[PDB]
Amino acid sequence: RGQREVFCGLTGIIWLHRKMQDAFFLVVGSRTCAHLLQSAAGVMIFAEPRFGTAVLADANAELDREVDRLLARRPDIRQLFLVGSCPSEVIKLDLHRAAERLSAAVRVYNFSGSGIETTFTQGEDACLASIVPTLPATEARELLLVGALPDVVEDQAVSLLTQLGIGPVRCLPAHHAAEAPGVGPNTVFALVQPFLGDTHGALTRRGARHIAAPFPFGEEGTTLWLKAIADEFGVSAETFEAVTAAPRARARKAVAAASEGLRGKSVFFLPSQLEPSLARFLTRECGMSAVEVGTPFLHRGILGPDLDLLAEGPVLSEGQDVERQLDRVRAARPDLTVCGLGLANPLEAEGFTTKWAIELVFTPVHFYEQAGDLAGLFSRPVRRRAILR
Amino acid sequence: RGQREVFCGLTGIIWLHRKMQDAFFLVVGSRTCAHLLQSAAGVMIFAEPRFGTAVLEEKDLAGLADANAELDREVDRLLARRPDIRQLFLVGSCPSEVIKLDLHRAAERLSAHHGPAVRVYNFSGSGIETTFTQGEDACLASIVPTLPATEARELLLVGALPDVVEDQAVSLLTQLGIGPVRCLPAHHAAEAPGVGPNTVFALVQPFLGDTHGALTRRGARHIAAPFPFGEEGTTLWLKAIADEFGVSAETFEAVTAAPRARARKAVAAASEGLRGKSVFFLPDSQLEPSLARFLTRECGMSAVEVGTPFLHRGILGPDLDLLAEGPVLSEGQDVERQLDRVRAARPDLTVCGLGLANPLEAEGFTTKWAIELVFTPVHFYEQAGDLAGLFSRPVRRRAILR
Amino acid sequence: MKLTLWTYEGPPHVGAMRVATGMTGMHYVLHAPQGDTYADLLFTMIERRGKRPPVSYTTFQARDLGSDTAELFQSACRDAYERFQPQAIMVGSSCTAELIQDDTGGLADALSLPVPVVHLELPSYQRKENFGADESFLQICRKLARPMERTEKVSCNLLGPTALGFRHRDDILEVTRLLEGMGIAVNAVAPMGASPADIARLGAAHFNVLLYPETGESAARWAEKTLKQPYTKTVPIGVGATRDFVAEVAALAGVAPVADDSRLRQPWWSASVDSTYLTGKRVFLFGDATHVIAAARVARDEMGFEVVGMGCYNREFARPMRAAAKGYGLEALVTDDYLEVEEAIQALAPELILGTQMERHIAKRLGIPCAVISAPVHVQDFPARYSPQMGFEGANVLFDTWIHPLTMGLEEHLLTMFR
Amino acid sequence: LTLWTYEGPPHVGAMRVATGMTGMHYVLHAPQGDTYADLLFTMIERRGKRPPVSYTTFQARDLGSDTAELFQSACRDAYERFQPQAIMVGSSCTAELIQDDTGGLADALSLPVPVVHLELPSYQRKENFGADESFLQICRKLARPMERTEKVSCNLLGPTALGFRHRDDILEVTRLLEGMGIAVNAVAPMGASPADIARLGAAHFNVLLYPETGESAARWAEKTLKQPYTKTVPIGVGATRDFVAEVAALAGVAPVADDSRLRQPWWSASVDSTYLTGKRVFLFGDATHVIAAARVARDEMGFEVVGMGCYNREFARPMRAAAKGYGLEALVTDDYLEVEEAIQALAPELILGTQMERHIAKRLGIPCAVISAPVHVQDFPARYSPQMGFEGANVLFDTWIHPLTMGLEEHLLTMFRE
């Protein structure tokens, strides 16, 4: 270990802001954070987004002042979630302390996706987990789905889920403030989102039982996900398969018709946190001789179906350093080294075809037609390399 | 009698159709005229303007029956595609004139079958017998004979001037209150005037040298007054109009604090302007003799030259009276000798048709574009104040640039 | 007599004057009826030259009909000769002059002024601006340029760049730089920046570089036929064609192919992570034949986005566009009507349309990104800056000029319909 | 509460500098997430080299003296990676303002001069001094007072990577100097080598390109190396000619100036360039560019300068110096909200400046172009886009008048057919 590569947690803010509308995602700190968000967004900063960027006792007084400034400039916030960053946790600025004290309609909730603690997409983890604690408990068998998956495909997931025969959904990412997901002891919840380890842990900590979660990335990735959903709700096999075979066929045809040029490949997964799930997604269509698949944060947990359905070829190395991982990349010579960060494009500048993670994260790739173009996403660098060599 | 720098009247269509929003100026001619209209309109040719600009091919060049047959078929196609055109305008052109294409015969034959739905008028914009803005005059003289005949004694506003110009003119007129005001450019049928033996062609624009004769053939009368292009030009135009109708001077001087006093104030508010400098008018817009007098008296012009494409004796008569005798109304002006005279005189202005504006700016001489002037609202009282500033601005351009 | 509300290239006499005002000391007396002098505004106001486009018209009026207009042409030519004293007089007509049968040749021939008199009797109802420029420059070389002793060093007369043209001033510089760095000497740069003496000097070389086939292909073929100098086939538009041109002229001159690649950024700027969303975009390519022909090569090989539909209004250069289309299995739209481009790009709705300024405004109407890569343009597209299109800097300019519509469209969409 | 930040943090400028220096490295204690700027110079300024600046990325399990150990571990590993030529130390200050600087193993390398270090002030800087405290240290240490070479030589000082069109400014000024007879010993701030930066004595006078980063370097070099810099700037025709006067005066050579290419003075003299006379123009952006552009506007363009505010208020007095030159005051604030308010108040017709002002004017309807530093990928171009010299004055015309083409042709289209 040594130097790291991946983004800090604030890159998940660009997705959380887009997905759940009535929310606030103000980060704190220096221009290094206010500029990662800026450049990553591109035009969001011009579209006047819903987040911001603020300018031990002195630090806490400044925290209170800046939170009041949030409440002032946007007098329409009721289910805000402040975002922590590296300096705030360096001086250990408790966002819960500011939220609880300054809640006295005005309900302030905390969240800390700081890259010193957080990683590439664990900001989503920390935020979705921070939704859970204060909320009370529900007392019925619902299916509390989770994850900030695209709303266009959130409709597909809800439609399929109700076709299974489930009760209420009440998705944990609060895209409406009124829609408050309670954490019930009888609540059985799946996991759409692979980087929801902290969220799943906190949801089970409050009491909600968790369903087996092979994460939904088309074909078996979502097959076993929704199968676990069905066998947990006791949906008849002939009911589930009847109402879900067509999405399976659509995704299977789409991935095959989108990965024609992805044959004879070695997809190195430098640390998206999708790495085990995407590694399994890239085994059957055409030829994907996957190689070392690292993550910025890995737990098997009950998230284990990834590794259970994963092969042994690609090394599941948790914790890495690009300053030697790229040496391993040179030695390996992987024909598509999808590299989250650290080196990234210079890999394409030293004869290594490179794919980048946030394209996968911020482009609908979850089951049906969404996972259908996951193959197209992974073919993007390859279809570039085929011509613009 | 050599080269002269001035446009053909086809460039009058760019302002003509912007007033009469029920008119299509179907400009026949070659690809050269089409390129003129294209470049002149600039970006306007892209928002489907009412040009047409139908070019004649070499196969359509030879013969005359084929040309009008194709013209008929495309006119019918256009009016089927755009059934919102009433006053059709088959504009001539130098190519069309050399072919001797009869726009009047075409107008008769076409109103035979378009009827009241499309009433066609025909005129010319050809540089052979027309210059930059005498195409406006030919267009207005193409609707004057077809104007509703009557006998009621009333005044007009002859000249296809901007809509705001006419609005201010009539608003001032009714603040005075004089006769039935009937704006000669019939933008549509809702404001169609009535001309007759007891009417008057209250001309507004000096290049209107043929509509005066036409609506004289109508039998009307002239307000013998300088062409309204500023404080005193429009002052005498309006004063003579009311004296032709008999309106007391009490209202004259009681309603002219905002219009007239502020008109002269705005015109002479060009401190640098052209106070004491020179102008050498190349043939640009039949509009130089009018400018020289009120740039001389109000803006303080030397007015070395008053060169014009053509000078009309009577209609600019009172306008000429306020003009100094020094400058000479040279006609058929050869531009080359005129550059020699500019180079000798070293003026501070060289108004022209000016594809030699930048060329004359290269030799240090300041130059101003009278085409924008004919385009910009420059008439009557509130908008001649910025006529003066429009002349002034190139002087400041030279001052900051040199 | 169709309702052509927009001609693609102006009257061929305008193209003829593009050659005229390009060369110092060459005066184009034109027998244009008064008003046809807008083209002077074209040259001093689109291309912004600090000198009356030295095209001394006659501007005859209705009073000057019959033989009076010929007398005015005589007078105008004589005044031009005794006023500017050109080193070679250059005569021609306009559309209406053809309609008068004005015969600008015999008049100025009988004037008997000592300087060379070239004729420009070109059709105007059948041709357009580019043919006028090409034919005028070819005739210029035909009269003045003569086969003479070659330069002691290898020389590379540039052929094609006329004065008024979409970025001729900067590709003349770019190709001069390429040839001088590689080892060849630019003997002349006709017809832009040249003169009658330079036209005569065209003979002292070893090959005749063809920059613009549309405006200089006739000149290059005539030079290879007469001056005994093989014209370079591939134009330096695009990295592949730039290397092809470099190798070709290094073979004609027999010199080492030195070509400074520290400037070329198009291959890296495109073959990278961001410019990978290019791959798959269904582009449509209309406009000037040669620029769009090599634009197809750049777009496919070195840019990525897939080509659907590529026409060109240039008819004399139709076949090379048909070939560039059939290489990818495409067709060629070879008419000169803007509405046809309109419904073509409706039927084949693209994301990046490369074409003229009229294509730019067509796409502005519908709302798809559009670039300018072709001839009919405005004051904006004639730049004061270094904006070439032939060479390695030409490839860089092509990259940026094409990507800017894509960035424009992307920002316009995502701004305020994704956030 | 800057929703958009004009310039980056004070480390991205140092990385800008080191990107053009093949070999020179910079040990920065930046947590993972501060490595987003490792993208900038291959993402925004799309190049093909991982920035030569060390990163440590100390995590949550690494707070305190552990970060001090990771400093040395990262330094040693970075040296063993590619054998640098110089090492610079400095932190993002987040958990350690001044409290882990550990030279112990940063020195003891083959590196002749290990004292090289860039400390950037805490929360008081942006992407100017990041690249300026670069050449106040990296050229204050490894640059020798070498003998002035036989021909009158010079140094192209100032241009840093991820800078506004700096790579082409370099070539234009080098072309000017070589055509005038002035040798360029090295383009030291960009596209150079540590050997070249050591060769700063073989230059009769530094040629300064912009105060943004090279002002400190030029001032120090004239003070120390005894080679004066060009006090004028080549942005603008009159400024270019005065720059030529200065370079030839300090050179002793003829003031050869290739104005053959120069077309802004003429293209701003045509009558298309007359309708722009008196056009009120707002000018916000970096001081060097704003002063040069506003001089050009006010005298030679035709526009009337109604705004001259800036965000580089460090050298505050030379800002309002030009403002009194135009008879105005300077808005030296550092927020785009004030820019929005000012352009709303004055309602100009051209808002020339950053891409942020570009998007304000897109949202406020006003025309606008890019003349300033805070720009994204599209304004770091592949084409030859030099903002300095005669071709710099040439591009400054078309760049400024394209938005006026927008605001004019759009108006005509929307008013003609409605």
Ligand code: PMR
């Ligand atoms: C025939 C060549 C030419 C070009 C290409 C245009 C467009 C255009 N001509 Mg001017 N212009 C030329 C001539 C004329 N323009 C015309 C219109 C018009 C005006 C009033 C104005 C303008 C202008 C220009 C310009 C500047 C572009 C701009 O204004 O947006 C173009 C390319 C501009 C300028 O100051 O120049 C006179 C301006 O104020 N054109 C007219 C009368 C219709 C003609 C005959």
Ligand code: PMR
């Ligand atoms: C924070 C660093 C960084 C930079 C400088 C930008 C801007 C920008 N980012 Mg990438 N972008 C960053 C991060 C991200 N980008 C974002 C946006 C965006 C996308 C969708 C795309 C991309 C790209 C770019 C672009 C160029 C956009 C282009 O020309 O298409 C810049 C420099 C672009 C590509 O070619 O590279 C992956 C592409 O299609 N980014 C996203 C969300 C997916 C993230 C978090």
Ligand SMILES: [Cu+2]
């Ligand atoms: Cu733009």
Ligand SMILES: [Cu+2]
């Ligand atoms: Cu634009």
